[model samples]
Target chain A: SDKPVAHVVANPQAEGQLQWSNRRANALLANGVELRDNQLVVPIEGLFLIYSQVLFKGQGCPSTHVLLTHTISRIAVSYQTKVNLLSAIKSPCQRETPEGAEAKPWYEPIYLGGVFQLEKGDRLSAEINRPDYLDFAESGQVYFGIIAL
Target chain B: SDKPVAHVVANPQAEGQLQWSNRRANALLANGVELRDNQLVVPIEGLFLIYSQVLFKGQGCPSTHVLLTHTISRIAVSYQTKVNLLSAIKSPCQRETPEGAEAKPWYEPIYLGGVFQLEKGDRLSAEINRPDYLDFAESGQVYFGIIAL
Candidate 1:
C-alpha cells in the first residue's frame, strides 16, 4: 500500500501557489477511494507540499510536510508524525489509536495555496514529515525530552 | 529526559490549552548541555517558555512524536516539525536519513501558538495515531492508496 498511488502534480499555478485541490482529488479517486458527505472521520486523502526557507544557512536541513485535508481554508494542519508505507519509502513514524483501533496517522499538509510570498529560488523541499509536526514541536518539544526521561 | 527541562501546564481556565516555561537550567547545564544564540538549539540553560493549544482532541494523551515551540506573534505558527531524536522513534517509511545524526528529517514544527475560536467545550479527540505506529490501515492512509498499476 505504500507504493506510489500516481504521480499527481503537487501545486497547480492556477489555484494560487499552494492550492492542492487537483492533486488531492486525483490521488483519492485513483485508489478507488470515496468520501461520504460530511464524513466525520480523519482525512484519508490530500497531499501536503511542505516548502521552507533557510533562515540560518545550514542551520538544519529545512523540510516540509504536506497534510491531507478534505478542503483548505477550513481546517488548519491537523497533526504531524511519520509512517511507513511500502518497502521503498518508510514514513518517519506510524500512528496507532489510543483504543488500539488502527487508522491513518496524523500529518500536517503544507499547501502551496496559502503561500502568498516567496522569493524566486527560495529553495523548497517536500516529504511526509508529519502532519501537525509544527504543532508537535511547539507543544511537545519541552515535554518530550522530559517525559521520555 | 523524562523529567522536563520545563513543565507542561494546563490553562487553568481552558481544558486542552497548555503553557510551559523553563524548569531546571541547572540540571541540563549540569549535564554539560549548552544553549546557543540560535533558536534551533534546544535551551539547555537559561529561561524559556512557549504556549500551545490542542489541535485535536486526544484522550488526555499526547502525540507519540511530542512537540514544543515558542509562539511568536504574526509568525502564523509557520515553520516547524518533529525530528525524531532517536532512530527507533521514526517510522520505517520515512527513515532515509541517518540513525541519529544532528541532521536530516527536517520538518515544520506544529504551530502550537495561535488563536482558534473553538467553542469552549470543543476539544481535540482522537484515539492515538502517528506515523510512528505501523499498521495496515494507517499505511493505506499515508500512501493515500498507491493507485498506480
Candidate 2:
C-alpha cells in the first residue's frame, strides 16, 4: 500500500499561517505523509485528493465584515515554487441590521478542495487572511486533509 | 482500475435538489460513477472520498438569513436506507451597518467531505434548504463529487 494520507485539526492559538494539532484522534499523518509545522510533505507522486474547510464567526452591530479567503498552496521543492492550488473566498461584506434589532453573531464557512497532480517533493499548506474569525471550538469545524488516489 | 470518480458544478436555476451540467470542462462523470440529476451513484464497494461545497450569497439592509445547512446523504440501495452522511451549519445571522452604511452582499461557503465505506449502488447527493442563496457563477465555487479510494 503506497497510498499516503494525512489530516489535521486547526489550533486556535496558531499565528501567521494556520497551525494544527495532529495528535488528536481525528487528525493523522500516516505512511508516507509528513507534517512540518503548517505544511504537509508529499512522499510520492500521484493524483491526491486534498481538502480544507474553514468556519469564520464574528459579532458587531452597525458593522461590516472584512472579505476573507481560504488558500491552499503548494511548495514545490524541486523548482522551489509556491503556487496556489485551491482558493475559496467569502464576504463581500454584508451591511445588514434590522432598524430596531441589535447585533448578532454570524458565521461563514469556506471549503476548498481538488484532485491535483503532484510531484514527490511537493508540500501543501492551508492559510486564511483573517484568523481572528476562525472557529476552533470543534476539531472537525476547521481542517485540512489529503489522501492518495 | 477500480476507481470510480465524478465532479459536477452547480446550476443556479435548479429546483429542489440542485442540478449540474456534466458536459463542462470542470465537470465529469467518469468510469463507473454515474450522475442522475443531483446524485452520484456508487459503482463498487470500498472507501470513497465524498465532498460538497456550497457558496451562499445574499444582500439586504434590513434583512436576516435563515440557518443554512450543507448535508451529504447516502441512498443505500440495498437496504433502502437514507442516512445523513455529513453535515455543516452556518448563520445565526449578523446585524451590521456601521451606524451609517446601507446594504451590501455577503457570501458563505460550506464544505463537507469524508471517507466513507460505501457499498455498490449507494447514491450520494447534496442539498440546501435555501437554494436562492447558492452561487453558481463559477464552476468550482459550488460543487459535489466523489472518488474511490
Candidate 3:
C-alpha cells in the first residue's frame, strides 16, 4: 500500500499563537497524506509515527524565568476529538550574572515524537505555548512529520 | 519473512568516549534486528527510517563558549566502513552575568531522525562530541530506532 507520509518544515517567521504551520518549508508528502489547514490528514488506517520539533530563541531573557511548552496532538475521527499525544516542557532559569555590555541570544529546541494507531480520517498537528519566542528560520531547524506503518 | 525493527534507549550514565549505547533502556526489538556491541544490525535489504535522540545536561556552564555535536552513523557490511548519516551542531552561548549565590543547571536535548535506504547487514549507532556532558537517564529521553518501510 502507498501509505501516508509527510515531512513539513517551518518557514522563516512562521508564527502562530496556538498551532504551527510546518508545511511552509515542506520536504516530502506521499500521495495519501494531505496538508489541510496546517494539519496532516491521514489517508489509510494503520499505526503511524508522528513527530515535531520547535526552536525558541530570544536576544534577551523574556522574563526572570521562562517556560516553553511544545506539543504534538491529533484529531481523531473515531473519538471525534483532538488530544495531545506528546509534550515537551522546559523551564529555563535566567542566570543571576550582571547584564554584560554585549547581550547574547539564546536558543532552545523542543522535540516531541511517538507512535500511535489511528483511523483513516485521523489528523495530526503541533502547537507551542510561546510562539513569539519561536525561531522559525528556514534552516530546517523546525519540522513535523508522519510515517505510516 | 521477519521485518527489521529496533527501539533502544540509554541507561543512566551510559557515557562513552565517542559512541552512544542506545540499548540499555530498550523499548522494543523485532526478531530480525540485533543489538550487538551497541549497534543495531540490519537483517534485510530495503529502505528504512532511522532515528536517534541525545539529551545533554550539566550542573554549570562548561565555559564562556560551548558547542554540542550529535551524530548518527551507520556501518555497512557492503562498504565495510562507517559514515555519518545525520548530525546536529549547536553552539549555545552561556548567558554572562554576575555569579548568583545559587547556580542553576542547564539541560538540552538534540533529536536527529530521518529515513534512509539501508542495505542488509548494515549496523547503525549514535555518537556525540562531548560524551561527558550527556544525560543517559533511564527515561525515554535518549533513544535510537529503525523501521523498515
Candidate 4:
C-alpha cells in the first residue's frame, strides 16, 4: 500500500531534533524519512504537523534579561536561511520586589505547534535563545517533534 | 481524492475548545468533524496531532498555591470517564518577599502537545482548572487543536 500505516504518519516524535549527541533514532521512520544532523527528513511531504516543548529552569536572576525566545524553524532545501514556522516568547522578570535579592527561583514551560506546507526531504529545527536554561538533562522534559497530517 | 484536503488535514485549529459560548465553528470541519459542546468530533480517526496553548494571568497571590494544571482529554466513546492525551503543569510560586503584601502580578503561559491513537467519532476536550484565568478576550492567545495525521 502506498499509504503509510496510520501509526507512523500520525505518530508524534522527535527522531531528529534531540540535541543530545548520544540520543538518536534508528531506521528510516518506516518510510524513506531520514533523521540526521539534528534535522528531520520529510518522506513525501504534503502537510506535516510540527511542535516543540521545552521546560526551562534557572535559580535567581543571573542575567534576568527580561525574556527568552523559542522557535520551530524550517531548516533546509528551498529556504537557505530557515523558515520560522512557530515562535514563543516568555516574559520572565516583569515583577521585582524592593526586598528581592537572590531567593527567587525560576521555571517556565513553552509549547508551540502548527501546520505548514513542506517539500519532500524538508528539514526542521527547534531551539531556544538560552541553551543553558534548557532542562533536557532529564531528557523528555524538553523535546521537538513533527508528524505527517 | 477520498483523502481530505492537505490544507485541512494539517491545519492548526481550535473550534470547540474555546470556552467562550460565542465561539463556535460551523460547517462540520470539511470532513464530518463536528465542533460542539466544547468537544471536537473526530473526522475519521487515525493518528491525530493534538496540541493546546493557554495564557493565564492574575494579580497578587490570589491563592499563592504555587501550581496549576492543564490537560487535553478524550471526552467520548469507548471511555466514558475521558482519556487524558496530554498533561502539563506549571510551578508558579517558590519565592516571596519578607515585606511583601500584594504587589506581585502573575502571568504564565503553558503549551503542551503530543500524538495519540484516537478512534472515529471521538470527541476531545481541552481545559484548565481555572476558567476564570483563561484569556479568551484576546481570542487567539489560548487554543486547543487536533489535525489528522
Candidate 5:
C-alpha cells in the first residue's frame, strides 16, 4: 500500500523553524513519509491533508497575551516555490480583574490545517513567530501531520 | 472511485449543538457524505481524518476571556461506542487596560482535528458548552470536515 502518512511533534528545546521528533511520544512515522531538515517530506504525489498545533502558556500568569501565530509553510514544485498554506493568528485582549485579585494561569493552543495538492518531493513544516511562548513539552499538544488522500 | 469527503460550516444563526449549512459558503457536501439532524453521516467504512474550527469574537472586548474549548466528538465501533477524539481548552489572561482607552473588538478561532478509524453509519457532530460565544457568519471561519484516508 502506498498510503503515505506521518505525524511528528515539536522538539521540547527546539526553536526557530521548529524541529520534529519522529520517534517519541504519540508521534507516528509511517508509510513513505519522513522528517528531514525540519520538514515533513512527501513520498507520493497526491492530495494531502496537513495539520499542526502549537500550545502556548505562561509560567505564572501574564496580564495580557501579546500574540500567537501558527503558519503552515510548504515548499513544492507545483508553484515553482514555497507558499503558505494556512496562517492562524490570535491576540488576547485585556480582561477586567477585581481589586487585588491574583492572576490565574492561562494557556492556549493555535491550530492550522487544510487540504492541498503536493508532489513527491514537496516538504511541509510549521513555524511560529514567538517561540518563547511555545510549551515544547514531550506531549501531543504540539504536533504536525500529513495524510495522503 | 467515490472518496468519502465533506466540508460543512455552521448555520449563520445556529446555536446549541450547531447546525451545518451544507449548501452555502465554502461548504462541500459530496462523495456520499450528508448532513442530517445537525450531524455528518458517514456512508463508507474505513479510516478518516476529522477536523473542526470555531471562531469566537466580541464587539466591545471583554477584559478577560474566561475560556475557549474545541472538542471533536464522534460515534464509532472502534472504541466500542462514541468518544472524544480531541479536546483543546484555552483560557486567556486578564489584561489591565489603561484609563481613557476605548475597548477594541477582539476575535480568535479554536481548532481541533486528528485521525480516526470509523465504520459505516457512524455519525459526527460538534457540541459547545458556551454556544453563545460562537460567530456563525457567512464566512469560511467556522467549519467541520471529514475525509477518507
Candidate 6:
C-alpha cells in the first residue's frame, strides 16, 4: 500500500504553515502537500499516525475511493517548532518540551485535549472530519496519541 | 488439637500494678501461675492455650516430682481501643494526673516523634529481642510497626 504522508497541525483549524524555518518548512512541503500560502501547509514531522483515504471515482459527485494506508515510517520531534508552538500558551518555561535542540528542528507546542475534560455526561464533545467521506465511512479508523519527550 | 487464647499484661513493669484485663491472663493465674509478688503477670480476661507435663519421682531431675508448662496467646487490638488511642493523641486537653491537678501526659507536651528530616543515604533502624540462641546465630527477623492512632 502506498503511504499517505501524515499531516500535523498545531491547531486543528489552522493548516500547516511555513511557520517553521526553511530547513523545516520545506521538508514538510517536499512530502507532497501543496503549501500555497505561507500559513496553509501540511506537516511531515512530529508524532503522527495518519487517517487518510483514496479518491476513487464513483456514481456520486465525488467518488469515494477504496481505503489505503501504510504504518508510520519514522517519527522525529523538532525542538524549535515545538517550543514555538508551546510559547503561545503559557510560555516555554512553564511546560516541558522536546530534547536535542541542535540535532533537529523544533515544532510549535500544541497540547492535545483529553477525553474526560471534553466529555459531558455520556457524550463525546470532540469531532473528527474526513477528506474522502465514503472511504472514511467504510474504513472508519482511529489513531493513538503520541507522547513527546 | 489445642485452641489458642488472648491475654494482656495484667501488670506492666513499672511502679504500678499488672493490668491483666485479658482472658488468658486470668486462666493462667487460675491454673496456678501466681500473679503476685511483683512477678511479671499476664492478665487472663480473654483467651489462652496452655500445655504442661508432670514429672514423676522416678523421672530425672534428681528423683524429683515437678511440673512444667508452656503457653501461647495473641494480643487483639479492639475497636474501642482504636477510638480511645486516637482521641488521646489528637485531643488538646490534658489528662488529670496524680499531682492533685490536671496535668498533661509526657506525650501530650512532647507530641509523638513526627517531623524528622531524612537526607539522602540516611539509614532507618529498629531492634527486637530474640532468643539467646537465635541471637547468637545471626538469623534475621522482620519487625512490623503499626500505629494505633
Q: Candidate 2 residues A35-135, lDDT tens each?
A: 87568889987777888888887775365457888878887865486666566777734554558666677777777997765779788888889887788
Q: What is the TM-score of each candidate against the true structure?
A: 0.18, 0.66, 0.66, 0.61, 0.66, 0.14
Give the better candidate number (5 or 6) by lDDT: 5
Q: What DockQ results do all the predictions give, each relative to the true complex?
A: 0.02, 0.28, 0.17, 0.20, 0.23, 0.01
Please tell me which predicted candidate would have the highest DockQ against the true structure: 2
For model 6, residues B112-140, the per-residue Cα lDDT tens digits are 01111112222111111111111111111
Error of 6 at A99 (Å): 34
Interface RMSD of each: 17.8, 2.9, 3.7, 5.2, 2.9, 31.3
Instruction: Summarize candidate 1's per-residue lDDT along A11-59 as a digit string, tens digits.
Output: 3232212222223211221232212221111223333222121000011
In angstroms, give how far residue B15 of model 3 lies from its true place.
7.1
Q: lDDT (0-100) at residue B67 of candidate 6?
A: 22
The share of true interface contacts that also appear in candidate 5 amounts to 0.27
In model 1, how large is the Cα lDDT of residue A135? 25
What are the per-model numbers of colliding residue pairs? Answer: 79, 6, 4, 0, 5, 34
Question: What's the TM-score of chain B for every model shown?
Answer: 0.18, 0.86, 0.81, 0.73, 0.79, 0.15
- Residues forming the 10-long window of minimal summed lDDT in candidate 6 chain B: B82-91
Which scores greater on TM-score, model 3 or model 4? 3
Chain A TM-scores, per candidate, are 0.18, 0.86, 0.82, 0.73, 0.81, 0.19
What is candidate 2's CA lDDT for residue A32?
88
Pairs that collide, model 5: A94-B63, A95-B63, A95-B64, A95-B95, A96-B63
RMSD of 6: 33.3
Model 3 global lDDT (CA atoms, 0 to 1): 0.69
Candidate 3 wrong stretches, greater than 4 Å: A12-26, A62-66, A78-81, A92-102, A129-132, A136-140, B5-16, B20-47, B57-59, B71-111, B114-127, B135-143
A115, model 4: CA deviation in Å?
4.5
Which model, 3 or 4, shows the larger lDDT? 3
lDDT of each residue in B1-149, candidate 3, tens digit only: 36677787776553554333434534778868887777888888765777888877776663475668676777888447666655555544555346653445777778887655567788887777887777765477777888888
